Design a protein around this ligand. Structure first.
Ligand SMILES: *[C@@H]1O[C@H](CO)[C@@H](O)[C@H](O)[C@H]1NC(C)=O
Lengths: 49, 101
């Protein structure tokens, strides 16, 4: 139920939010909303046990 | 009023400081999922209305001063310091802005 953002194109300013969820461009081919090679979702879910 | 935000309609976070003449409303809409609501009276009131809007560390500081103007073509040559009016901890990007007509 807990998620963190690990992919971004820039660094956060102090006291600001970023709730946008688009597929990060980790390469050169465009993701176009579809995950795959060099295209990773920025929201990774936690696995607490 | 003025619309602040990264995009025009959606996909990011936006701002809305729309106002009318009868009640001076500062209703801050954070719909784009409401996360910040605020409303108070004083925002506004041949006259020149000088304003300063800033965004430092997520704080929206608004200055305001009303000054009578004569010979309204070009800009006057004088001094009239602006006073602080409204502080808002909105905490968003504020990439660009658009004036509401
Ligand atoms: C807003 O986002 C852009 C990139 O989308 C970035 O360059 C800029 O520094 C950001 N500004 C703030 C105040 O976070």
């Amino acid at each position: 139920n807990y998620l963190y953002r690990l992919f971004r194109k820039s660094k956060l300013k102090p006291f600001e939010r970023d709730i946008s969820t688009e597929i990060y461009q980790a390469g050169n081919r465009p993701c176009n909303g579809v995950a795959g090679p060099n295209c990773y979702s920025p929201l990774q879910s936690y696995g607490f046990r | 009023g003025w619309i602040f935000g990264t995009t025009l309609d959606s996909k990011t976070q936006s701002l809305l400081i729309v106002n009318n003449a009868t009640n001076v409303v500062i209703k801050v809409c954070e719909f784009q999922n409401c996360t910040f609501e605020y409303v108070s009276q004083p925002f506004l009131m041949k006259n020149l209305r000088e304003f300063v809007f800033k965004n430092i560390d997520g704080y929206f500081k608004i200055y305001s001063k009303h000054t009578p103007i004569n010979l309204e073509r070009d800009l006057p040559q004088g001094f009239s310091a602006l006073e602080p009016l409204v502080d808002l901890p909105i905490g968003i990007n504020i990439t660009r802005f658009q004036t509401l007509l």
